[model samples]
Target chain A: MIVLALDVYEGERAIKIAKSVKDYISMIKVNWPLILGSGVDIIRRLKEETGVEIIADLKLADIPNTNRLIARKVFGAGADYVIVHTFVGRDSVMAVKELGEIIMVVEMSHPGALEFINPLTDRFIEVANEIEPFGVIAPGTRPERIGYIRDRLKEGIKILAPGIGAQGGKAKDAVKAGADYIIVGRAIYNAPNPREAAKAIYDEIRG
Target chain B: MIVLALDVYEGERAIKIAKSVKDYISMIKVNWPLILGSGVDIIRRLKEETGVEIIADLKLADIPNTNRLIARKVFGAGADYVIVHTFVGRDSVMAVKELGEIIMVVEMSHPGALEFINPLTDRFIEVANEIEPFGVIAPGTRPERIGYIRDRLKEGIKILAPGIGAQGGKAKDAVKAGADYIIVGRAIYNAPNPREAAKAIYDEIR
Candidate 1:
């Protein structure tokens, strides 16, 4: 599935762009900027218009009660899934999971991710296995890491990868490495024609 | 300085509590729940009505560009200082620091914090030192840990601690351990008389 990561800070522009390219994507990912800048009203409108699943990429990493409150609020704001960190412990992750599905961040996709996340990969996956998250986020740019996680991850836990195109990750490579969905942000959003960009990725994955 | 953590989810309650006890506190710490539930308008009003600095406790951990955008928005919303994770890297922290001062999270108060944070403490502090944040957050509930951090931290880099009172920490001990400010939330907010609770903590600290 092609998940369009609406990483734009401006709410209206994100909404407008999502409307045009809604047909080519299976899910829409919203982060802190748009939620803070616009509010959940944009989320409600996106679902109403496109009928696609919305993932709240809040990256929640707080205590159990705080995470629960955030989960309720974000889901109440109309998100189908919320991404969170596993470092908060089992109870905290489970607290949010009771409200909605969670996509555990086993590894992140950035230049600095290696410094800390590399050593903790074993523990992160161990927790992910125990909690049984809806999906696990592996950096698409690192296909070997993706394969490493894919080999150990239990069935039914889908792989959601970010860092495609703009972040030096390919849709085809991520899929071949076992990503169920490739999350692309700037490559599509910054494109002259976002819909065509989405279509090209969709077709590439389909092929 | 005593920082009253406005931990309420409702905007009006947070504003009301801040107004009642503003005289006793030097700063107000607003976390994700209050910000997301009410909006930054609540933050602007809290500062305007109470005349206290606001700390946006975002705990931001994202890429450099994304963290930069988040910092712009949070600071633009009227936060004097924002809390962020040092795990994001030097460039990301530096990007946010350009906009406003950062209270880098070197350690957290929760029980689960020890697992990942303890091992990465040295590296986290190295980044914190390189960035030269306005402050560093150490767990108040653990004063020895606070003392360890305090020993390594450079002079003038303030230590702001949470987990006091409600989280089983005392203001005096954390202060003795080198905390410049103790962040009190439920001990003040959930009290029948917030002002008196604030006054009590203030007196204890003094």
Candidate 2:
């Protein structure tokens, strides 16, 4: 579950990076805006050639119907995962999960993610949990907190952690915090040798 | 002025489409989302090959300083026309016009666009006119409304209209409506031959 995040602006470089690192990574996470400008072909090409999965990171914040339409389109475009803003509205979230075939992950990232989560109490989790998403994508890479979430919640739930690489969280610290999977971006992509940099992080995770 | 709207979902197609249509269009617009996925390489390639002016359509809508930062980055990335959102905040419209070096247009075409505009007083027009953008982009394709805006707004400002063909806009109607330039997407993309489609539209506009 060690996903490599490609927060890239250039498509060719993204392909090169994806090809070079596909073997070591489980999936690729891409932000929405980049897909608008440079994805349809590359996404199909990569899926066909490399056999790695593609995650669409639009973070849809609109109403449920709009989100559903976008979800269908993204799935039609061949995305394996899509991120939607959890704060859009609970009913909207419920509606999206019911019809959209792709697995949904309620995003609780951003520095302000908890601002709402802290206030919502367990009821929010109750509704979100019922949908049984692929997992919750949380920011911060603390490994110990992973146990806290698992103990409180039911079994079979995975925790996806970002903010570990370029965003300033340590990979080892994140793994220790209980992240089922870690998503790293700039830490590897910005390195002098991106391919080697990614492999080193992958090997480190194994050892 | 003819501008090609490259609503690309892939990098190679963006490069191919930009190169193919560069000679016929005055400027090429690259939406921000594509830049996020493909990165700057696609735009750079577009600039190098097409030699047509570039429009970075981030429709940037944020705080004043943040907007400035985005504007500078877009211009640095070689955009000749930079689009800023019309409704993010007050003073943003003015702020972008003041700080941005490239041609700036305020967009009011989203589904919610008219909800904000339809209720406005003359002062809204006054303020928008005061900013004096290179043009204003409005999506309604009715000739009468286009004619109305042309009559209502100050003289010399151009209008860029989307929604032709697939979006239910007619180029002839757009021209009659007062649209100086029509920004077409699906019509050209879905055509049997885009070159012929471009020529047909060009003939209609002329």
Candidate 3:
């Protein structure tokens, strides 16, 4: 399955792109770009617009009290899954037990991913095993890392990879390497025909 | 200086408390609670209402591209200062150079803070010196950390401390320990006399 990451700044543009690509994708990722542009209400609007599960890629890293407060806002706004950072430790991550499902960002696909976020991949996976969240986010750009992360993550915990096109991750390779869903954004959102682009990725990953 | 941190989840209550305490504070800290409740526009609204400077306690931790994008959004909303995390590395934090000033989070005021955030304190300081941001956020709950961070941070980089009052750190100690501004939220915002509560912190810190 493909997860559409609508990383656009404007809400109208997000809706337009999401509506156009709804058929090819079942999950959509919304982040600070859209939320800051529109508001938390945008998450509800996106869900209403496409009937797709919404994941808020908030990258939240804070104290337990603050984390749970922030989680309540997004979850209350109808976010099915929230993307959180594990560096804050188990207490903070587990603090949101009352909120909802969270997808731990075990690793990212960026130049600085190796700094602190990636080195703790095993640690994050351990937390993932304990948290037993709905899923975890791995770098699609590094399919091998995905395979490695997938091997240790607890059973039933899905792996969703980002950094597909612009960041140089191949959709096919990411899926083959063990990601349950490939998150594609600019590759599809900025394409001349977003629907066609989404279709291409959906077909490529499935094939 | 005392910075009022209105961690209230309601927009109307945030405005009421901000307006009530505007006389004692020159800066107010707005986080996800206020922003997610009212929206980013509230930063601008709060600015227009009280003329107090706004420091958005976003604790932004993202990649370069996403960091800069979110920076542009909040800064455009009339925030005077922004709090960011450095664990994402120097490049991501620097990518926001085009945006306004940022306050790097060196340490937090909570139990789980020692986990990863406190361990990378040295690395965070090195970046703060290089970035030369407006300031850095240390733990008001731990006054000693404030003094330690103050000793090594580059010149003119102020230290803003949170976790005061309800979090157990005294305002007087945080200021005495080297914090430029102590952030007080629950005790002040949730108090019966919000203005008097803010005044108490303001007077105590001074």
Candidate 4:
């Protein structure tokens, strides 16, 4: 599945971009920018108008009660799922999961990812498997890392890989490495024709 | 310094609480709930009305560029300082610090804190010292841990300890262990008379 990551801070621009790419993508990943810029109502609008799943990429990592409260708000705001950090431990992650689908961040897909996330990869995977999350996030930039996580998990938790396109991960390689969904941000958003750009990646995944 | 943590989500309620305890606190810590519940404009309102420093307790963690953008917004909204997670690494943490005063989360005060933050304590402190943040967050519940981090740092980086009053940490002990500021949330907000509660804590600290 192709998930368009609307990382733009401007609410209207984010909604416009999501509308342009809606048909080509299976779901939409809304992060801090759009959420903070547009508010929770944007999630409802995207889901209602675009007819796609909405994942709140908030990466919530607070105490149990706070996480639970935020998750309740996110879900109430119309998110089908919410991404969270395992760093906060089982209780915090569990609290959010109870409200909606939980996508655990195993490792990030950025230059600084390896600095901190590398050391915690094993532990993150351990918690992911133990909890049996709806999905787990692996850096699309590293397909082998995706393979590494895919190989270890005994459960059939889906893999959602980010860092494609602008962040430097190939869609084909990510899919080949067992990503059930590929999250593409700037690659699609920055393109002259976002719909066409999304289609290209969608077709690339199909290939 | 006493930091009054406005943990509530409602804008009017948060402002009312901040008003009641304005004189007792040095800085106001605004978390995700208030930011989301009210909006960025609320930060400016709280600062303008109360005449105190605003600390955006977002505990931000993301890519460097994205973190920088969010910090820019938080500062643009009139925050004097912003809290961030060191887990995003040096570059991401640095990105936010450039925008405003950065208080790095060295360790958390919650129950699940030790399970993850404990392993990275050494490295977190290393980066905190390297960056020389305005302050670093330590659990008020653990005074010894506050002292442990205090011993390692070269300069006097201010220690902001949370978990006081509501989370079961004593302001006296946190200060004794070297906390420069104590963040109090529920003890004041949840109290029937927030001003009295805040003044009592402030009085104790004074």
Candidate 5:
């Protein structure tokens, strides 16, 4: 399956891209840029306009109270799911879960992630097992880590991998290594032809 | 000095609280509640309406590029300083700093913070000393940690301590233990008289 990382800032351009790729993707992921640019209503707009589910990738890391405030706001605005960072510990995670389905970031897909986040993957996994969230995020850029995370994570927890395309994670490789959804951002949206780029990945992973 | 944690979700009420205590507080801290409730433009609204600077406390932790996107959006909307987590490491911090001022959370002021965040305080401090961010956040809940963080951090790296009142951290003790600014939320805003409450803490410390 494919998810589009709709990190675009302009509302009209974001809508156009989501419309182009809606047929190939399972969900369109919106982060702070889109939300800040168009306000939280963009979630409802994309959902209504393109007829696709939405994921809010906030990567929230805050005290439990602050986490509750943010999750309530985003979920209130019509997000089907939310993404959070696991390092803030259990309470903050629960604060979000009580509000809606959550995709926890057990490991990230970047070089600086190696500095602190990588070393703590084991404990982050422990939180994943305890929370039994809707899903978890592992790096598509590192498929081997996805395999390791897939093996250790409790059954039924799905993995959504970032770092596809511009970040260098191939959709074929990410799905083969056990990612439930390969999240492609720039590779698709920034492509010479957005729909073709998305269709290529969608068709690539069909087997 | 004092920082008012203006976490109210209503734009009118948030402005009321900020206006009530503007004279006593150095900065009004806006979190997701206010920003998400109103919009990032709330940063500009708060500054223009109350004549105070703002700290957008998103406690950001994401890849460097995402961090840059968020920091730019918040700063573009008129945030004077943004608070972020150092655990995402050096590049993420640099991304925010390139836009505007930053306050890195070296440690937090909650029980759950101990699990992963508190353990990384030392390495976080290492990031702080190397980056020399505008300041670092130390837990006001634990004044001893504030003392310890104060001693170890390089000189001139200020500490903004959170957890006053509702969270049970004392303002006087936080400042006495080397906190440069004590952050208070429900303690001041939730009171019958927010101005008097903020003034009480201001007078208590004075």
Candidate 6:
């Protein structure tokens, strides 16, 4: 099961594309600015029109008050999952967890992410030991480190890995290492037949 | 005073805005997401349209290698200043400094910003001092802390403060506390007449 990441503009063509491969993809992640520029109504429409679960890749990082309001809005707007950065401080982490009932992934991606996540490995576990989450999101296309991340977090938390498509990453190696979920964006979007390309990868993962 | 940040959508708006507030404000800022959404053509247009200095809030916080690429891109894109986050580690700081001969201010806003900026104050300052940017951007809502920040640096580095008006900040207090420039967002943008708002701010400062 992999998340289909769409970082670019999703116009009418995107809508038609989503409708075509609704089954092969587990969730559709839409980066916020593109969604805002493209229109959220289109997202609500895409959900109803295609039946695929939607994830808003907002990567929201802010104060507690603002985080709660934005989390509420994102979930209320119909996102199945939302991305939040842990670097925003503890208040923000709690705020998003409370408001966004859906899956909330901590952005341990980017080279900087490890700076925070690396140190807090044990503290996050011992402190939030009982407070398990939907998953953890880490980037950098570093598959070798996933095992360490998996070992540190609670057993059930899903690991979503991006940077495999572009930004010089390997989906096959990333999965073999420990990625529970792989996210591919531009590679598929820029492909001639995006839907067919999705199937081929989906089939590869299953195979 | 204060530089009126123009977060324009495209070159034409960038041009029109610079024309409208040539003397009213001292500086302009263009956020990268908006720039990418608008395209590169506008960056050229913005510089040509307004000879006024510009800051590109790229906030490029990544590894040292990627930071260099982004820094060059933003500079080549025509930014006099760009935003970076110190939390990205020391390598990112050095890379950004080497790539763009522009101001690179680490993001010290948001509740989470305090977590890293507080404990690593010495480290952040060391990097800032080493690079010597024209200024640093501080969230203006916290007036009491401004004086301390100025005292710590000792060296003259401009402080660009945000959080005025719509963001629920007081510009007067920021200026009183030594804020060189206050970033006013919706407070002016959503105003019935932004031009008048800009002028009023200018009058207050003058």
* Docking quality level of the chain pair in candidate 5: high
- What are the per-residue Cα lDDT tens digits for candidate 3 across A29-139? 999878888888999998888888999999888778888998998888889988888887777887665599888878777787778778878977997898798899878
- Candidate 6 Cα errors over 4 Å, as ranges: A36-42, A68-77, A101-131, A163-178, B2-84, B89-114, B129-134, B140-144, B151-157, B162-177, B183-206
Report the interface RMSD that candidate 3 achieves against the true structure, in angstroms. Answer: 1.3
CAPRI-style quality class for the chain A–B interface of candidate 1: medium
Over B10-71, each residue of candidate 1 has an lDDT whose tens digit, in order, gives: 89988999999999999999988888889867778899999999999888877777788888
Better of 1 and 5 by DockQ: 5
Native contacts conserved, per model = 0.32, 0.01, 0.76, 0.51, 0.87, 0.31
Native-referenced TM-scores of chain A, all candidate models? 0.94, 0.83, 0.93, 0.92, 0.94, 0.83
Residues A86-180, model 2: lDDT tens digits: 43345555555564433333333333334333334244345456666666665554444455555554456566777665432366657666677
Worst 10 residues of 6 chain B by lDDT: B32-41
Predicted model with the maximum DockQ: 5
Judging by DockQ, tell me the better candidate of 2 and 3.
3
Off by over 4 Å in 4: A165-169, B165-169
**Cα lDDT for residue A131, candidate 5:** 93
Candidate 6 Cα deviation (angstroms), residue A111: 4.7
What tens-digit string does per-residue lDDT give for candidate 5 at B86-172? 999889989999999999988876778888888889988988999999899888665688899999899998998876544323667
Please give the lDDT score at residue B50 for candidate 1. 98
> Alpha carbon lDDT of residue A137, candidate 5?
88
The collision pairs in model 3 are none
Q: Report the lDDT tens digits of candidate 5 across residue range A63-142.
A: 88788888988988889999988988889899999999999988877778889898889889888999999999888665
- Model 5, C-alpha of A46: deviation from truth (Å): 1.3
TM-score of 1: 0.93
Q: If ranked by TM-score, best first, what sequence of candidates would result?
A: 5, 4, 3, 1, 6, 2
Give the docking tier of candidate 2. Answer: incorrect
Q: Write the per-residue lDDT of candidate 3 for residues B47-115, one digit (tens) a residue.
A: 888889999888888999889888898899999988888888777878765688888887765667677
Highest lDDT, which number? 5
Clashing pairs in 1: none
